[PDB]
Design a binder for these strands. Sequence first.
RNA 1: ACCCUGGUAGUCCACGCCGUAAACGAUGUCUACUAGUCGUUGGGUCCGGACUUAGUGACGCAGCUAACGCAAUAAGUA
RNA 2: GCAAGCGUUAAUCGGAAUUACUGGGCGUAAAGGGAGCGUAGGUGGCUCGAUAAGUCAGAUGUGAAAUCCCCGGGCUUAACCUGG
RNA 3: GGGGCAACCCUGAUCCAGCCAUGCCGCGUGUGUGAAGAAGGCCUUUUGGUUGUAAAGCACUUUAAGCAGUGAAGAAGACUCCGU
RNA 4: AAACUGAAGAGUUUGAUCAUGGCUCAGAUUGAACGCU
Lengths: 212, 122, 79, 156, 131
Amino acid sequence: ARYIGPKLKLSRREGTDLGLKSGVKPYDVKTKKAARPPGQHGVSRNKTSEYALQLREKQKVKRIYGVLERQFANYYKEAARKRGATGENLLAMLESRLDNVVYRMGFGSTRAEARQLVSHRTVMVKKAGRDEFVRVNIPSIQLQDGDVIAIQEKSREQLRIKNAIELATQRGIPEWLDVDHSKLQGTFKKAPDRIDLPAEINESLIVELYSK
Amino acid sequence: ATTNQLIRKGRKTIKEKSKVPALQACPQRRGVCTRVYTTTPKKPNSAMRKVCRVRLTSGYEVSSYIGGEGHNLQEHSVVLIRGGRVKDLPGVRYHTVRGALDCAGVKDRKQGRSKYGAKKPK
Amino acid sequence: ASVLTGRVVSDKMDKSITVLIERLVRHPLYGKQLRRSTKIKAHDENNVCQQGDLVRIKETRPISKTKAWTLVDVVEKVE
Amino acid sequence: GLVERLVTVDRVAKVVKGGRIFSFTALTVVGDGNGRVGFGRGKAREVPAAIQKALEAAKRNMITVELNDATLHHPIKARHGASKVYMQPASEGTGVIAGGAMRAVLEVAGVKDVLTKCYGSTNTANVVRATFNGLRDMSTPEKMAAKRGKSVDEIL
Amino acid sequence: SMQDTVGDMLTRIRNAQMANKVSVAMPSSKLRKSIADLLVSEGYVASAVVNAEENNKATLSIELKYFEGKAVIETIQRFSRPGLRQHRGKDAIPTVKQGMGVAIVSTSQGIMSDRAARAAGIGGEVVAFVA
RNA sequence: ACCCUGGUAGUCCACGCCGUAAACGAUGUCUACUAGUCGUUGGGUCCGGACUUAGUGACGCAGCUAACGCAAUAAGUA
RNA sequence: GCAAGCGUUAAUCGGAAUUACUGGGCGUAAAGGGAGCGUAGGUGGCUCGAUAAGUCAGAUGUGAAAUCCCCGGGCUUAACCUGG
RNA sequence: GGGGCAACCCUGAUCCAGCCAUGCCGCGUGUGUGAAGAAGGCCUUUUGGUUGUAAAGCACUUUAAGCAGUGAAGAAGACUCCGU
RNA sequence: AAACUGAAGAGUUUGAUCAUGGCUCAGAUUGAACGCU
């Protein structure tokens, strides 16, 4: 499954911007909220707890990447099984997801549209070494070093990708991705680093939530 | 407890018996209501709690609680029984499953309907 | 083959001796070793050794209902 | 830049002829974030005043701990009264695996990765005291080498 | 009765160090002198000398060290007591204080440090932990 | 019942049972080691004192203890 | 908060250092046997030798495969399968 | 795997298919934009808040399901002919 | 090269406290059943 309902109340509950809307206009005027979380009460008494902080951070990351609890707990399990920092590996996996990669490469205005673009078999992927693209419809496909992403020839002239590109131009393009707009192609040259990802997501909170 | 004493005698972990013997390590169990009555709770609380004495297929004759507001149970009613004791009812260690076999669900239940066997209103 | 060494605790059968084979066994949980002994019936064809000697026996085919070890070396006698 | 963390606030009562006199006890841990940490307790009839007194008492119970980067140098087992604490250095990215009372003092002292466990009584003040004692009694390889007289390479 | 000679020697050292004694003397044995020699070579005690007294007896005298007011021996605990002996392999010797301490190991090549036994690829009785 | 006046078993002896007590230091036995101070019992050796021994007490550091407290007669260190 | 599932009941381990080997206690919280003698057992002074059973190390044989873990590979991904 | 020289026969082993959310894993139930922030519900100090860009309206997309096509691999080349 | 990575506590005895100590809870798992879907 995936979240379908209104997106701005997610950011309102998180207290920050989750990039759930295209950057066509500032987040402040897009909602005139985010000073208070959704619902009747919002700003409340009886201050939050350590568990509340940990849960809110985990839900922040989950809602950023559109990933549900079972998938995200498998992500954490693999991240803790892999050599290195657990939170760093979890962020690396969530950023190596195919829908997030096409979002960051700019073919979708938002991550949900990028996911719906991948799922509808409009995005082709060429694994490093393989001399052939394949049409994939699995948004949670991880990309290795050197994987190439392309747009299906049937849908290269899309009136939504043609502004997702110009919006990505105004938002900023990561260095670990190489995008050719003329041929509508991208390359995942390397997994992103913790110094490249924003230093406002506290992954220590997630790692301490996932330890009972 | 020296090493020699531990090797000679050992440590002993006594095993706690089940709090729901009549189920015989089953999730639920079927019975027939041999009595449908009400009873008064323990000291802090006061009410007329609805209980049924039910004879299960396991050979036990136990007391189970009918939760929710209102029930259709009576003598010779075939009910399903699960674990879980009522805190203020002494001797009641089981709950009657509402909506299982012959115990009807709660009529106008809306919130926790699956806990009372109530179908989704359309 | 396999050779064991132990004292002779019984000899009162014909062509037969019981041998006490001591062994050290480590407790699986508490780590200490406990002295453990098994009585092994051995074949004493010539009825040589008496009770209290330290002898060596070796495994062979069954000789009787409970005898499958045979005397191979008397190393020390009682005092 | 002294980080102040309120561990516990509890309602205590004195009994007089008229009835009960309700005070308030607070426990705080303050820290530099690198190697300075100190705990303190405060009592007052109101929660803000108890917290302020706890903060001021914590600021004068300072010790200087020596971190191994962002973790401990060696495993520690410490105690205060019936409270026993175990602390173990962990790999980078583990986090402070600790429940509440240990976590307050460790995070405030600046430990980033540690495995902890409480045994015996988990009274918050006694647990904080035990963790404080373990941190204060922690030694470093350089200090051990200086103690013996050898070097950090003749003392692996 | 006294049935742990190594434990007695270690307790003597511990009690003298808690009492801020300059030196501790005890009846000497070759195993005690070897353990004291390892302590001297590890730098936990200043020296250890065996004075041969009369009646085929000997006194082991150990000079203790104090650094910055505190005792140099922070802790010294017997591991393999007579009632429960502990033997470990080369990769099973317990590390004391992450390696900043010493595990006294009596191996077939003599009594050495745990790090020395690990370097030699050897094991033996783990008699004490000194930190 | 407590109180008073009486009073039999028992209390005493011999020989057997009984095998229990807050049979307590509510602290198993045996070792070694760890500031000190003041009594006292039975010795010993010196010059009325000093030292030392085996008990038996009152204190009191370190250490231990939830606290009370224990503290060379440990509830300390093993 | 989970999500084509979500709850409840049953059951095992965990948290429980609450049988404590790792890793607990017994003056007063539960807990020193009324005291002793002692059998089996457990444990045990110093020095020089022998032995090598325990112990330690090495070699060799075995410890099926599957499973677990690590490095790869094949299903669009994953589950799954698979080489070492 | 059984029998037969073969042809071939037998094989409820097995390879498949059916039923079941019983589990694990994967995907979907749309995606963007959209304010005098519509109505209705709820709360309220009776006028504001909230449901909420949520809806409607616009602009798109068609994964899975459906319809129509095409279409590997699982097959080890039997028999027969020729040569050595 | 690697197999070498792992450890959280809370409530409840008291006017209040510390300790002791039981009971209860948060996790994981299932050849599961049941209720709603």
